[PDB]
């Protein structure tokens, strides 16, 4: 599948979008944050 809303979540403009970012990286424990056309995480959910 192609690396244009199929590999970053359909994620995009730094956005939540379709797939939610938030979500591949909750399987992590992790906040996920759209850095432009792509999906990586952000800090640990353990906010404390």
């Known amino acids: ?3 244009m809303a199929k ?3 359909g994620c995009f403009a730094n956005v939540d979008v379709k797939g939610d ?3 591949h990286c909750k ?3 992790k ?3 759209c ?3 792509k ?3 952000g800090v ?3 906010y404390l």
């Open 7 to 9: 590999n970053q979540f």
């Open 27 to 29: 399987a992590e424990d």
């Open 35 to 37: 850095h432009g056309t």
């Open 1 to 3: 599948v192609h690396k």
């Open 21 to 23: 970012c938030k979500r």
């Open 39 to 41: 999906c990586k995480c």
């Open 44 to 46: 640990p959910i353990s």
């Open 31 to 33: 906040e996920g944050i």
